[PDB]
Design an enzyme around this catalytic site. Structure first.
Site, short mmCIF file in Angstrom:
data_model
loop_
_atom_site.label_atom_id
_atom_site.label_comp_id
_atom_site.label_asym_id
_atom_site.label_seq_id
_atom_site.Cartn_x
_atom_site.Cartn_y
_atom_site.Cartn_z
N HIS A 1 -28.47 -41.88 -5.69
CA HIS A 1 -28.38 -43.17 -4.99
C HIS A 1 -29.73 -43.84 -4.86
CE1 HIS A 1 -29.32 -40.93 -1.09
NE2 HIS A 1 -30.23 -41.89 -1.14
N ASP B 1 -24.61 -36.93 -6.25
CA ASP B 1 -25.77 -37.82 -6.38
C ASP B 1 -26.99 -36.94 -6.56
OD1 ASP B 1 -25.51 -36.97 -3.76
OD2 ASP B 1 -26.30 -38.85 -2.89
N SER C 1 -35.00 -39.25 2.03
CA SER C 1 -33.77 -39.48 1.28
C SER C 1 -34.21 -38.95 -0.02
CB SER C 1 -33.45 -40.97 1.22
OG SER C 1 -32.30 -41.25 0.47
N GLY C 2 -33.52 -37.97 -0.54
CA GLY C 2 -33.92 -37.34 -1.77
C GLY C 2 -34.74 -36.11 -1.48
ZN ZN Z 1 -26.32 -40.72 -2.03
#
Ligand code: ZN
Length: 204
Positions: free
Chosen positions: A36, A71, A157-158
């Site tokens: 994402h 993802d 995030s990630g």
């Molecule tokens: Zn995601």
């Protein structure tokens, strides 16, 4: 928290001049993060100016990529990292982490200068995450319980979930709302993706 020199695999990914996602160095030329984050183009600051700056060329989103499912995205660095004490890849999982294991997540505080904080996390089982998110398909996910009083929004995030200096997960969703540790986050379970990850890295 987060002693100096730990997390040499920590990677910050920028779009434009702006922060976008975290990621892990799984190879001197390869970074792994959530699909994402693939708005693209991206560039990667590695190591913990900037110790080593690189940019990405190949970005391979998982073919199988409601929330984002599967993802995972592999970012290829333009030029290889020079493996130092300072910057190293993170060993990929040779094994799946079980519920009850004590793991760790390091984060800069985006989603709320810099500097990394470490928080210990408890693998929950793909059961009591269906309690917080009824209708979630787990199977390829691990839900990571954060200890009470910890702000969930200190992750990025990630970002990686490390267990015993292995990479067991990449953060998918479940950070919000900030201000309560009661809900667990949702990480991609990386020990289920090894076939694909080794294949795009060509690392075999
Ligand atoms: Zn995601």
């Amino acid at each position: 928290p987060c002693a100096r020199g730990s997390q040499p695999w920590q990677v910050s990914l920028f779009n434009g001049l702006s922060f976008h996602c975290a990621g892990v160095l799984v190879d001197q030329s390869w970074v792994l993060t959530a699909a994402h984050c693939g708005n693209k183009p991206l560039w990667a600051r590695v190591g913990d100016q900037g110790e080593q700056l690189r940019r990405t060329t190949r970005s391979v989103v998982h073919p199988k990529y409601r929330t984002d499912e599967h993802d995972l995205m592999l970012l290829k660095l333009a030029r290889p990292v020079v493996l130092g004490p300072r910057v190293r890849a993170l060993q990929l999982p040779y094994r799946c982490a079980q519920p009850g294991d004590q793991c760790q997540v390091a984060g800069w505080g985006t989603t709320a200068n810099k500097g990394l904080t470490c928080s210990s996390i408890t693998i929950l089982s793909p059961k009591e995450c269906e309690v917080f998110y009824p209708g979630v398909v787990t199977n390829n996910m691990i839900c990571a319980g954060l200890d009470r009083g910890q702000d969930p929004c200190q992750s990025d995030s990630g970002g990686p979930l490390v267990c015993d200096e292995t990479l067991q997960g990449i953060l998918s969703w479940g950070v919000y709302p900030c201000g309560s540790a009661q809900h667990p986050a949702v990480y991609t379970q990386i020990c289920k993706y090894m076939s694909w990850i080794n294949k795009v890295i060509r690392s075999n």
